[PDB]
Write a protein that holds these residues in place. Sequence first.
Motif, PDB file in Angstrom:
ATOM      1  N   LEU A 125       5.540  16.350   8.735  1.00 54.26           N
ATOM      2  CA  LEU A 125       6.575  16.383   7.707  1.00 54.26           C
ATOM      3  C   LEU A 125       5.965  16.449   6.317  1.00 54.26           C
TER       4      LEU A 125
ATOM      5  N   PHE B  12       0.822  -1.210   0.000  1.00 51.15           N
ATOM      6  CA  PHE B  12       0.000   0.000   0.000  1.00 51.15           C
ATOM      7  C   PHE B  12       0.858   1.264   0.000  1.00 51.15           C
TER       8      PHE B  12
ATOM      9  N   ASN C 140      13.030  14.430   8.507  1.00 55.66           N
ATOM     10  CA  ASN C 140      13.166  13.056   8.036  1.00 55.66           C
ATOM     11  C   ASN C 140      14.029  12.229   8.982  1.00 55.66           C
TER      12      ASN C 140
ATOM     13  N   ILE D 295      -0.181   3.718  -3.106  1.00 50.12           N
ATOM     14  CA  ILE D 295      -0.886   4.996  -3.002  1.00 50.12           C
ATOM     15  C   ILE D 295       0.001   6.138  -3.478  1.00 50.12           C
ATOM     16  N   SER D 296       1.131   6.337  -2.805  1.00 50.59           N
ATOM     17  CA  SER D 296       2.035   7.419  -3.160  1.00 50.59           C
ATOM     18  C   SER D 296       2.766   7.101  -4.458  1.00 50.59           C
TER      19      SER D 296
ATOM     20  N   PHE E 211      -4.351  10.375   4.645  1.00 48.07           N
ATOM     21  CA  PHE E 211      -4.196   8.988   5.075  1.00 48.07           C
ATOM     22  C   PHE E 211      -3.308   8.884   6.307  1.00 48.07           C
TER      23      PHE E 211
ATOM     24  N   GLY F 282      10.414   6.336  14.187  1.00 52.25           N
ATOM     25  CA  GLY F 282       9.824   5.138  13.612  1.00 52.25           C
ATOM     26  C   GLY F 282      10.553   3.880  14.022  1.00 52.25           C
ATOM     27  N   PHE F 283      11.888   3.909  13.980  1.00 50.88           N
ATOM     28  CA  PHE F 283      12.653   2.749  14.407  1.00 50.88           C
ATOM     29  C   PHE F 283      12.467   2.480  15.898  1.00 50.88           C
TER      30      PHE F 283
ATOM     31  N   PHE G  61       8.400   1.525  16.451  1.00 52.52           N
ATOM     32  CA  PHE G  61       7.821   0.369  15.789  1.00 52.52           C
ATOM     33  C   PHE G  61       8.761  -0.825  15.758  1.00 52.52           C
ATOM     34  N   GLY G  62      10.070  -0.610  15.608  1.00 53.62           N
ATOM     35  CA  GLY G  62      11.006  -1.704  15.762  1.00 53.62           C
ATOM     36  C   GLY G  62      11.010  -2.268  17.166  1.00 53.62           C
TER      37      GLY G  62
ATOM     38  N   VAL H 277       5.564  12.413  11.232  1.00 49.15           N
ATOM     39  CA  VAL H 277       5.489  12.089   9.805  1.00 49.15           C
ATOM     40  C   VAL H 277       4.435  12.941   9.113  1.00 49.15           C
TER      41      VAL H 277
ATOM     42  N   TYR I   4       6.810  13.131  -5.373  1.00 51.80           N
ATOM     43  CA  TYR I   4       7.006  13.603  -4.010  1.00 51.80           C
ATOM     44  C   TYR I   4       8.230  12.936  -3.398  1.00 51.80           C
ATOM     45  N   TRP I   5       8.505  11.700  -3.817  1.00 56.43           N
ATOM     46  CA  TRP I   5       9.649  10.962  -3.300  1.00 56.43           C
ATOM     47  C   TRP I   5      10.959  11.487  -3.862  1.00 56.43           C
TER      48      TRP I   5
HETATM   49  C1  CLA Z   1       1.743   0.349   7.892  1.00 54.01           C
HETATM   50  C2  CLA Z   1       2.064   0.670   6.636  1.00 54.01           C
HETATM   51  C3  CLA Z   1       3.234   1.373   6.198  1.00 54.01           C
HETATM   52  C4  CLA Z   1       4.546   1.313   6.626  1.00 54.01           C
HETATM   53  C5  CLA Z   1       5.205   0.494   7.644  1.00 54.01           C
HETATM   54  C6  CLA Z   1       5.296   2.276   5.778  1.00 54.01           C
HETATM   55  C7  CLA Z   1       6.668   2.565   5.881  1.00 54.01           C
HETATM   56  C8  CLA Z   1       7.255   3.731   5.405  1.00 54.01           C
HETATM   57  N1  CLA Z   1       6.652   4.823   4.812  1.00 54.01           N
HETATM   58 MG1  CLA Z   1       4.749   4.864   4.249  1.00 54.01          MG
HETATM   59  N2  CLA Z   1       2.790   5.069   3.736  1.00 54.01           N
HETATM   60  C9  CLA Z   1       1.932   4.000   3.680  1.00 54.01           C
HETATM   61  C10 CLA Z   1       2.085   2.754   4.360  1.00 54.01           C
HETATM   62  C11 CLA Z   1       3.162   2.387   5.108  1.00 54.01           C
HETATM   63  N3  CLA Z   1       4.459   2.899   4.911  1.00 54.01           N
HETATM   64  C12 CLA Z   1       0.788   4.331   2.839  1.00 54.01           C
HETATM   65  C13 CLA Z   1      -0.325   3.429   2.548  1.00 54.01           C
HETATM   66  C14 CLA Z   1       1.004   5.623   2.363  1.00 54.01           C
HETATM   67  C15 CLA Z   1       0.143   6.397   1.464  1.00 54.01           C
HETATM   68  C16 CLA Z   1      -0.611   7.514   2.137  1.00 54.01           C
HETATM   69  C17 CLA Z   1       2.261   6.083   2.929  1.00 54.01           C
HETATM   70  C18 CLA Z   1       2.792   7.373   2.757  1.00 54.01           C
HETATM   71  C19 CLA Z   1       4.049   7.775   3.127  1.00 54.01           C
HETATM   72  C20 CLA Z   1       4.658   9.121   3.071  1.00 54.01           C
HETATM   73  C21 CLA Z   1       3.995  10.284   2.487  1.00 54.01           C
HETATM   74  C22 CLA Z   1       5.863   9.015   3.754  1.00 54.01           C
HETATM   75  C23 CLA Z   1       5.986   7.592   4.111  1.00 54.01           C
HETATM   76  C24 CLA Z   1       7.199   7.248   4.768  1.00 54.01           C
HETATM   77  C25 CLA Z   1       7.460   5.946   5.138  1.00 54.01           C
HETATM   78  C26 CLA Z   1       8.705   5.503   5.903  1.00 54.01           C
HETATM   79  C27 CLA Z   1       8.615   5.807   7.382  1.00 54.01           C
HETATM   80  C28 CLA Z   1       9.840   5.209   8.033  1.00 54.01           C
HETATM   81  C29 CLA Z   1       9.824   5.388   9.516  1.00 54.01           C
HETATM   82  O1  CLA Z   1      10.014   6.416  10.165  1.00 54.01           O
HETATM   83  O2  CLA Z   1       9.546   4.229  10.182  1.00 54.01           O
HETATM   84  C30 CLA Z   1      10.645   3.348  10.514  1.00 54.01           C
HETATM   85  C31 CLA Z   1      10.669   2.198   9.568  1.00 54.01           C
HETATM   86  C32 CLA Z   1       9.716   1.257   9.451  1.00 54.01           C
HETATM   87  C33 CLA Z   1       8.479   1.234  10.271  1.00 54.01           C
HETATM   88  C34 CLA Z   1       9.868   0.156   8.460  1.00 54.01           C
HETATM   89  C35 CLA Z   1       9.845  -1.213   9.108  1.00 54.01           C
HETATM   90  C36 CLA Z   1      11.042  -1.403  10.019  1.00 54.01           C
HETATM   91  C37 CLA Z   1      11.031  -2.774  10.681  1.00 54.01           C
HETATM   92  C38 CLA Z   1      10.705  -2.647  12.155  1.00 54.01           C
HETATM   93  C39 CLA Z   1      12.362  -3.489  10.465  1.00 54.01           C
HETATM   94  C40 CLA Z   1      13.475  -2.939  11.334  1.00 54.01           C
HETATM   95  C41 CLA Z   1      14.866  -3.259  10.813  1.00 54.01           C
HETATM   96  C42 CLA Z   1      14.959  -4.641  10.179  1.00 54.01           C
HETATM   97  C43 CLA Z   1      15.430  -5.666  11.186  1.00 54.01           C
HETATM   98  C44 CLA Z   1      15.876  -4.649   8.964  1.00 54.01           C
HETATM   99  C45 CLA Z   1      15.696  -5.926   8.170  1.00 54.01           C
HETATM  100  C46 CLA Z   1      17.008  -6.425   7.605  1.00 54.01           C
HETATM  101  C47 CLA Z   1      16.785  -7.374   6.438  1.00 54.01           C
HETATM  102  C48 CLA Z   1      16.896  -6.644   5.115  1.00 54.01           C
HETATM  103  C49 CLA Z   1      17.770  -8.522   6.490  1.00 54.01           C
HETATM  104  C50 CLA Z   1       8.748   3.973   5.644  1.00 54.01           C
HETATM  105  C51 CLA Z   1       9.689   3.553   4.540  1.00 54.01           C
HETATM  106  C52 CLA Z   1       7.923   8.569   4.960  1.00 54.01           C
HETATM  107  C53 CLA Z   1       9.386   8.560   4.614  1.00 54.01           C
HETATM  108  O3  CLA Z   1       9.906   8.522   3.500  1.00 54.01           O
HETATM  109  O4  CLA Z   1      10.198   8.620   5.707  1.00 54.01           O
HETATM  110  C54 CLA Z   1      10.332   9.882   6.365  1.00 54.01           C
HETATM  111  C55 CLA Z   1       7.097   9.652   4.184  1.00 54.01           C
HETATM  112  O5  CLA Z   1       7.480  10.805   4.016  1.00 54.01           O
HETATM  113  N4  CLA Z   1       4.966   6.868   3.684  1.00 54.01           N
END
Ligand code: CLA
Lengths: 98, 83, 143, 146, 159, 740
Positions: F537, D74, F431, D78-79, F586, F438-439, F442-443, F534, D83-84
């Motif tokens: 932002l 999602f 950012n 959506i996005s 959203f 976020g980390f 949610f982490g 967020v 913007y990215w």
């Molecule tokens: C629940 C659903 C969901 C999730 C999790 C994300 C996640 C993200 N979106 Mg998104 N978003 C979503 C739905 C979602 N999106 C939808 C539907 C829309 C449309 C409206 C958007 C619109 C949107 C915008 C407009 C923006 C984001 C941004 C972000 C980032 C925020 C990162 C942060 O601070 O959190 C921390 C990170 C997380 C929660 C990701 C999961 C981390 C888990 C806990 C793993 C931890 C580490 C792990 C162990 C590493 C794995 C290693 C492996 C490879 C081996 C991230 C990439 C923002 C961005 O770019 O960042 C500022 C931003 O500006 N999103």
Amino acid sequence: YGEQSKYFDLQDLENTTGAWDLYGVDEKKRYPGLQEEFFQRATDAVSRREALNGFVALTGVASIALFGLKGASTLELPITKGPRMEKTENGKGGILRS
Amino acid sequence: SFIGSPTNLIMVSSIGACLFASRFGLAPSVRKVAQPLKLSDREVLQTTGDPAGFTATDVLAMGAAGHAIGVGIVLGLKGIGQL
Amino acid sequence: PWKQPELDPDTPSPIFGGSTGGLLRKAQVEEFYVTTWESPKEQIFEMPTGGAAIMRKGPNLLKLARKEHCLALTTQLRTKFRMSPCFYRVYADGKVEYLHPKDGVYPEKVNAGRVGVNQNMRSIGKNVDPIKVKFTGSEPFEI
Amino acid sequence: GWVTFYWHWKHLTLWQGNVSQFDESSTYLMGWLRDYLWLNSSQLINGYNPFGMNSLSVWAWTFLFGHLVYATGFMFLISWRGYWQELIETLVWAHEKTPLANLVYWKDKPVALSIVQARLVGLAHFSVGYIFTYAAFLIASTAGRF
Amino acid sequence: KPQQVIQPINGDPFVGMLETPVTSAPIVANYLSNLPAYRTGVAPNLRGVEIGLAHGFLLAGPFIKLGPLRDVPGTAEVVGCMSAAGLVLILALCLSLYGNAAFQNQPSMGKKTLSGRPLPQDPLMSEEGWAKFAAGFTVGGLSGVAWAYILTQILPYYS
Amino acid sequence: KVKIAVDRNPVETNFEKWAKPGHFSRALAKGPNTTTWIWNLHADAHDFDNHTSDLEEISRKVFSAHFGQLGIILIWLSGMYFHGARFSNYEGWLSDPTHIKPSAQVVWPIVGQEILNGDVGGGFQGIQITSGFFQLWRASGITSELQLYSTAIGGLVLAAACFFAGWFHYHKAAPKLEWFQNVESMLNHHLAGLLGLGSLAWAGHQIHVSLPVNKLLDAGVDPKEIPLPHEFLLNQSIIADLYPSFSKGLAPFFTLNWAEYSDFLTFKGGLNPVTGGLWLSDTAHHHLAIAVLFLVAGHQYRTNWGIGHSIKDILESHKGPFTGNGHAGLYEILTTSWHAQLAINLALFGSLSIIVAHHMYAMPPYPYLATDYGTQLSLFTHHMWIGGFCVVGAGAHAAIFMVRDYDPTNNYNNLLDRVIRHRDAIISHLNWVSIFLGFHSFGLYIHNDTMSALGRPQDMFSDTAIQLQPVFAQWIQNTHFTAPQLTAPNALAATSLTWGGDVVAVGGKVAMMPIALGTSDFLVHHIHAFTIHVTVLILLKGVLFARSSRLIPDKANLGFRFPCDGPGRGGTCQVSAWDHVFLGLFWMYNSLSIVIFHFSWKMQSDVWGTVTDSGVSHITGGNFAQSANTINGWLRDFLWAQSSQVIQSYGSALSAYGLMFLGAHFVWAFSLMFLFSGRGYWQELIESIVWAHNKLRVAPSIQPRALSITQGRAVGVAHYLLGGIATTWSFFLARIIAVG
Ligand code: CLA
Ligand code: CLA
Ligand code: CLA
Ligand SMILES: CC1=C(/C=C/C(C)=C\C=C/C(C)=C/C=C/C=C(C)/C=C/C=C(C)/C=C/C2=C(C)CCCC2(C)C)C(C)(C)CCC1
Ligand SMILES: CC1=C(C/C=C(\C)CCC[C@H](C)CCC[C@H](C)CCCC(C)C)C(=O)c2ccccc2C1=O
Ligand code: SF4
């Protein structure tokens, strides 16, 4: 450069594009002299990227192989310990397999 | 507010001090616009009688400020147990 | 134009404050763009990458990291003040390029001095199918 | 999902012996939801309950994993790119113009995901999360009782 | 006398930075210029020795304190240290990969310190220089991990 | 200087512009050639900036628009009062508030709806309401349905007066631009006049009307023999026995003996134990002090009599060296841009609505409101969402001001220009703090989920395991609990029972009890901080990059609401600030949904419940300290442990909530067409349908066209938000009605 209003000259374009080291100094050997050769001889055998990539991989694969084979069961990791008696049967709605 | 009460004395002294303060400079009246140190001595409307700028809104505001200061002084002294 | 003009290093620049949007490391590594114009008086314009800057009576100089910023500033100046400026490109080695009209009387005019390039005499939609040009390296619109 | 919902619910009611429940409950969608997505998920979410944990821990974790990957789909869906790109440009200015990290510089320029690529990765996360969460729910619901 | 504290760098309003008290403070500028990564005249291996020592000394702490075996006495202080050493080895591998990646070409444009006077080339910005830097980093990280290990053995306080 | 400049009869009162629907826009004045003409008609209907470039006509238009909205709200309030007068059990609820559920909507027996007329008690059947109007009509002393009828008719009369006022003030006597630009007079008249006069009138109504009625209501006296408030108003003898200070008769007010008024202008902390709400004497002294504070603040600015403050001088005088020109031109912007003032007012209104929801859930200001869990939950959630919507609209209209009304001539080195200058630094630091929050929120949640799944609960972030104790919030709680002891010695008890030590209960159910904060509350609060960071932002980036950007330098000339600049630069889709607001809607939805989930779970697990002789038992098993640390715990113990009454609501009084739940699921799921898809596929499908209608000659004269890209995004976000809001509304209301 920067006489009264100009910011471009085309012969010192290193200044025109804005490439500036805001934090940069050229003071050589700040640590005491006897201290370098202890670490300079430390790096010379691993200074090459081939020697360093091998050494990291040498300590990588060997210690990874050490873990599990010898690394586990000495720390008593809860993966090579075994069960007491859990989870022989399965199915709460009957059938009772295994 | 009985004639002779300390609250009456505080109220009357506050009102008189405010009129004295607004009579000769010394207060941001309708005549004196206020900077950080309250200068420049302007003039609008008319004083209708006594000199300087005691207009209908000059005595209305200074009476309001003098009354409002008095409630702070009386209730402040009443809260601490004075008069 | 009649003669291709070379920008002068001596020309002043408008007074402006520090803006985060501006020249990047691409100015150092790759090329960057430079815009010049001659002013009648001191007016206030908005830079395409920053805020508002008061410009200098006479010659002026702007450095933009992209050509799109340069033409946005050019269109803004031409619309607001009938300014008619021109921009250039400065490479990493110091090479200077002229992209704003080499004919000098803008792409809106013709000047009878430029040759038609990337022009197809056939109608749009008369192009052949991609099967007819398959495994040839040439697109149907590139013919 | 519709055909597998139908198959799983009809066969589950056949195995449990109450086919009348499916016959009288598959007509209306509220009964569909209540007796399929809610009733059969009782054993699924109890995989690693704080009071007790059992062998269904991988299935609840995979269920939530599928939900998270669906939600990341999602995020890509959506996005859209544009913007990215500006946000990535601000991050470029952040990395290039900071102390102790301007020495480390990328060789491939960070650019936003292209629109076709955006749709592809959104579809990929969508389908991966869909498949994983449905497999987790189906296996947990069928194996908890029998 | 407006005291325009906020001004662009070198009076140039065209580039990224503007000179700000976070940047233009003499204490901050002196502290950053005296950090090992900005000592251009010093060899990159001597840079990496100090950088790896500091980072390997700091990285041991969270592994000992919040590791899976933190409740087991006597063994947490060894597991955290060897996991920190493994993390240092991983960071050294990624550092060597970056040195391979970013220095397969040759830079042609200098850094231009303030009011000119630039040196020919930073040895850190070279291929073999960054390889020596990563070698110093892994040696410093291993020595810092061992030092944080022996500091957890002899102690008057805590760990 | 300040005067009343009014132009008389600028617009004729006729249906000539009603005859042609497209008249405000010259682009729409030609005709409806395509089907997008209708959507442009209903979209640019109230966009007054492109209707005309004159600010005076725009000001008149928005003045009568506010008049029309006021008339609409007055019609709605009059309808609610009429519903409480005619179809309600308010008379029964007054005699028994703890056993009779409120009901004010009566359905027809037409098609199976008789099951919705639930047995709410008191010999009455109807829809169990949740707005809490009965609590308000018990606070403001109202006994019989005659008084509600009179209030409804008066509201209808004032609504007709407001509509006539809008018609007059636009078509008959329209004020000029200088009338609207009198900002000092506006602020003085809406500080001292509106707010201060309303606060003083409400304080007087509470003192002369609501205080005796509420004093007799909680004493066990039936409302039938309670004297009408005009008897209390006219006769000092009846009001003297309930409050002995009325025997003095306004003597202590003018003689500065206000300590004698300590019987009905009390300063008490806590709630009334009989009813569960705040003491009406405390609210009377509160509204009186608020009236004082707004009367003194409403005489600050200078309008016509020399004395006062000039806002331009105040702004231009506050200049500090790290800001260059300090607030130099903001008076010129805010006196000439409607959208800038709209952004400021909407942001402050939304934030204040958030404060309203928090401070009603904290201190219930109405009798028998704390025990009515449904009214409290509905009020908190509703004002929560309205505040979020107003904040998002504030961001949107700020971006609109940035695109349209912003000019670089007046601002050179002011605060707005410098915010534009260092916007990349702000966005990058936001950012960074976004990723950081976020980390380590949610982490942390995912790590707790993993350690629960790996069979290691001692490695989790919980109270039993290693914990993150919210020391600052608990210290603030302890300070506020001990605040009446030292720092506010005249307070009887603590200002709220959030941090207290006693539990109040009315009718055997817990009204308000002390709230304990643990690791789970820490995790959810930092999740909220992350989510709000967020969303702010996204909104701030959309506002800042609306004018220009490193990607698109000429975004200002492309308008505010445009779909894209084409697939160039890799694709500049959703680059407009309108799409930034579209995503921020959203993100708002996620933020407020998680916030109200936290509210419902925390209040049901640690506050709401039924008191017993052997301790206090809550609605749930008190599992918030054990299950709110993991995502699966959250899911199973909030969305699955509850909502068991929504699915089994069929055949009962609350089956309409299940129907609304599934319809909300439908609309939420239907939105993802307009969100995932584009326009070219839909346009080609419409072309095929057009061919089908062309084959047998039913071709419409208006060409059928697919929705615009901005139109499609708007439809998607609207359907998504409506579905999600109705989903949470149905689930919350059914759970709180079938249980609470
Ligand atoms: C629940 C659903 C969901 C999730 C999790 C994300 C996640 C993200 N979106 Mg998104 N978003 C979503 C739905 C979602 N999106 C939808 C539907 C829309 C449309 C409206 C958007 C619109 C949107 C915008 C407009 C923006 C984001 C941004 C972000 C980032 C925020 C990162 C942060 O601070 O959190 C921390 C990170 C997380 C929660 C990701 C999961 C981390 C888990 C806990 C793993 C931890 C580490 C792990 C162990 C590493 C794995 C290693 C492996 C490879 C081996 C991230 C990439 C923002 C961005 O770019 O960042 C500022 C931003 O500006 N999103
Ligand atoms: C003390 C005088 C006073 C009062 C009480 C108000 C009250 C109000 N003004 Mg304001 N206004 C005033 C003076 C005043 N105005 C002045 C001097 C100016 C010129 C600078 C304006 C210019 C102005 C604009 C431009 C706008 C308002 C608006 C509003 C309304 C905002 C709606 C709201 O917050 O909900 C409160 C709602 C209610 C209390 C509902 C009851 C409404 C009653 C019927 C109004 C009665 C107050 C009125 C002043 C009585 C005299 C009018 C008389 C000719 C009949 C509110 C009713 C907005 C609007 O259009 O609404 C009308 C708006 O956009 N005001
Ligand atoms: C103080 C309140 C206020 C005011 C005065 C305005 C005024 C304005 N806004 Mg703003 N806005 C507000 C609040 C406000 N808005 C809020 C709270 C939001 C967040 C949602 C927005 C978001 C917003 C955007 C994104 C845009 C505007 C635009 C506009 C302009 C034209 C609006 C128009 O013609 O709508 C026409 C009216 C409609 C389309 C009817 C609304 C129908 C909605 C979509 C669905 C409602 C469904 C309902 C809730 C439930 C019914 C269910 C159904 C089954 C029946 C105008 C300047 C637009 C503009 O161009 O600005 C210049 C623009 O692009 N505003
Ligand atoms: C010299 C002279 C004279 C005299 C005069 C006088 C002596 C006057 C006075 C006057 C005055 C002496 C006035 C006053 C006024 C006041 C006011 C106007 C105030 C206030 C009001 C109010 C209403 C209040 C309110 C309040 C309250 C209730 C509470 C809070 C606070 C306050 C206080 C604010 C004569 C003519 C004989 C003759 C000639 C000369
Ligand atoms: C479905 C879809 C369409 C097609 C939708 C269209 C053309 C709108 C259709 C609106 C209808 C006609 C409104 C009326 C609906 C019913 C006719 C009402 C029935 C009422 C009963 C009482 C009969 C788009 O145009 C589009 C554009 C951009 C992004 C996504 C999409 C998108 O998802
Ligand atoms: S997919 Fe749509 S929004 Fe994106 S660049 Fe193409 S036309 Fe514009």
